[PDB]
């Protein structure tokens, strides 16, 4: 539609000043490009510690969930002398494997561009032109001449002085919808287990589903073939398969029935984060160097990894 | 004295004259879009509506070129649009599924 219009209209000089010099042009261009884009800096670099993730709150496949991208499936047919330890390290087959790309040792900052961590001030029920003004005020109120947010803005998890002025707090079900967010930003790993063995919880020690563990431990891991130790051989798993049930932990979490839930905390990162605003840096830098330069400069910073963060899907746009 | 004339002024060298023939066929469109026999009826109603309205305000005009029916590109693109993927298979002798 745009090209067709472009193809029949020559240019005309109009005797007013250059839009590039007008505030309303600078403010609405920085907004349309960088409104919800932020940069977070760890106190020092520390990655997510394990390659396996126990997270029973998420319903398994049997709506589509984002975490299913990291879900190890239990297969009945395997090759001869096949073991999890060969492929997925110390992960429990039928749970979730975290790749080494999301666990880099040298990553110091996290860059994200989404409107899905804002506290209650933000509502999609309200009007775009309101939700603009609301943000534009808050960012002016929470800043002072630089692009660094005031500690008040952060949630209580990321800072001692945080009061959720801008951002909400990450909850237990957020891992299912927004995996990378949690793995890159959470200060501590909390587990959620209905697996028989964890926290030394024995089947006797309990003082349709009712009081029962989801996955019970079998004798050992083994395969067997019939003169064809290559392609197709039966596999006997070290735990059970949740294909039949697939709602157990999700229904348990919401408390429809009582069950022996296990939860253990493990500290990853210090609660002393620092957060910059790319919308406020665009406004401030454009007053000195002019928007044409600043726009081009900050658009490259969004492509620091090789994939531009602003063109990723809204829930999955988190990069280290 | 003078006043501005904001519209451009074009000096004519020559005129080029062209004839384009546009061919529409619903069945070709229904095959690619995986349509059902109910929606095929909508496609057909919709296309007739628009084409008929245009037909109803335009008289005919003679254009002094040769008949399209004599031109290769007209013969090749008409046979294609009708019979591209149509085939006939002949058994060695008649024998049905047993």
């Amino acid at each position: 539609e745009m090209q067709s219009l472009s193809d029949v209209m020559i240019d005309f000089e109009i005797p007013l000043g250059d839009p590039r010099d007008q505030e309303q042009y600078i403010h609405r261009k920085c907004y349309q490009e960088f409104a919800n884009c932020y940069l977070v800096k760890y106190k020092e670099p520390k990655p997510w510690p394990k390659e396996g993730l126990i997270a029973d709150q998420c319903p398994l496949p049997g709506n589509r969930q984002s975490i299913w991208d990291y879900y190890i499936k239990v297969e009945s047919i395997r090759p001869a002398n096949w073991t999890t330890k060969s492929k997925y390290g110390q992960a429990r087959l039928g749970s979730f494997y975290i790749p080494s790309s999301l666990r880099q040792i040298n990553v110091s900052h996290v860059l994200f561009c989404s409107d899905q961590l804002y506290s209650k001030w933000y509502n999609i029920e309200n009007t775009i032109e309101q939700n603009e003004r609301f943000l534009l005020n808050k960012l002016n109120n929470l800043t002072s001449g630089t692009s660094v947010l005031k500690k008040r803005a952060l949630p209580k998890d990321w800072s001692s002085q945080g009061k959720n002025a801008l951002f909400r707090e990450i909850n237990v079900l957020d891992i299912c919808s927004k995996p990378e967010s949690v793995i890159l930003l959470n200060t501590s790993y909390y587990s959620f287990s209905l697996w028989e063995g964890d926290c030394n919880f024995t089947k006797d020690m309990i003082s349709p589903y009712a009081c029962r563990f989801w996955r019970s431990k079998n004798e050992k891991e083994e395969t067997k073939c019939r003169d064809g130790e290559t392609k197709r051989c039966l596999y006997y798993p070290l735990w059970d398969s949740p294909e039949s049930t697939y709602d157990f932990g999700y229904l348990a979490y919401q408390k429809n029935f009582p069950s022996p839930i296990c939860i253990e905390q493990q500290k990853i990162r210090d609660q002393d984060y620092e957060v910059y605003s790319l919308y406020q840096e665009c406004k401030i830098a454009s007053k000195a160097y002019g928007i044409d330069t600043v726009l081009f400069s900050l658009k490259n910073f969004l492509n620091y990894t090789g994939t531009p963060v602003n063109e990723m899907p809204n829930a999955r746009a988190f990069v280290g | 004295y003078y006043e501005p004339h904001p519209e451009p002024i074009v000096v004519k060298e020559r005129v080029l004259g062209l004839s384009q023939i546009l061919m529409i066929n619903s069945e070709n469109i229904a095959n690619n879009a995986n349509l059902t026999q109910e929606v095929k009826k909508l496609l057909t109603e919709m296309v007739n509506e628009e084409m008929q309205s245009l037909s109803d305000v335009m008289i005919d005009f003679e254009i002094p070129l040769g008949d399209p029916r004599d031109q290769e590109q007209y013969i090749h693109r008409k046979c294609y649009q009708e019979f591209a993927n149509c085939y006939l298979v002949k058994y060695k002798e008649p024998k049905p599924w047993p």
Binding site: D11, P15, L16, P19, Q24, T127, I128 | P4, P6
Partner: protein
């Protein structure tokens, strides 16, 4: 070759206003008066209807508008 017309910028003067309201001033004459500052508009903000629509239904509504 790169065409660009001065058809609306031929006289070498320009009379500008600071507000649309200023056009009703009684001691102005019969001429062209330009508002001094551009009006900046985002379509996303203008078209509310699309905001609440989803998938191809959103896409087809924008097509009709464009």
């Amino acid at each position: 070759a790169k065409l660009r017309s001065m058809g609306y910028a031929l006289t070498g003067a320009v009379q500008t206003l600071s507000q649309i309201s200023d056009i009703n001033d009684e001691n102005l004459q019969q001429g062209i008066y330009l508002l001094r500052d551009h009006v900046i508009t985002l379509m996303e903000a203008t078209l509310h209807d699309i905001s609440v629509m989803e998938g191809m239904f959103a896409v087809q509504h924008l097509h009709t508008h464009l």
